[PDB]
């Protein structure tokens, strides 16, 4: 709860990459795509709709961690 509430660009890139890799491997879609044959476009649509089922696990340098939902974080 102490880190920045804004979702960084690295987190965005990694989440979009993981979601595109999953969707490319026959993952279920939660935004009801309309003729999008590119998995990255579907991942971006899910991110804009805030329906990505991925929780970022931010690790502190000492060893502590904290979980943040994609819908909980702030996007730009």
């Amino acid at each position: 709860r102490i880190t920045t509430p804004y979702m960084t660009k690295y987190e965005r890139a990694r989440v979009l990459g993981t979601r595109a890799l999953q969707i490319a491997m026959c993952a279920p879609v939660m935004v009801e795509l309309e003729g999008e044959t590119d998995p990255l476009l579907i991942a971006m649509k899910e991110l804009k709709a805030r329906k990505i089922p991925i929780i970022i696990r931010r690790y502190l340098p000492d060893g502590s961690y904290e979980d943040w939902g994609v819908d909980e974080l702030i996007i730009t």
Binding site: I23, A24, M25
Partner: protein, 50 residues
């Protein structure tokens, strides 16, 4: 040309091309024009999904 500098830090990769550049203002700043000949050679593996 050692292993560290020539084969570990910087190495050669496939699925790449090299071509001379020419101006084209009718394209967006985030877009780049690729020739048809190179496009037929550089392939992308797409997984079959629903």
């Amino acid at each position: 040309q050692g292993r560290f500098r020539g084969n570990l830090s910087g190495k050669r990769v496939d699925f790449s091309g090299r071509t001379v550049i020419s101006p084209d203002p009718n394209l967006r700043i985030d877009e780049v024009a690729v020739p048809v000949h190179v496009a037929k050679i550089l392939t992308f593996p797409e997984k079959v999904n629903k």
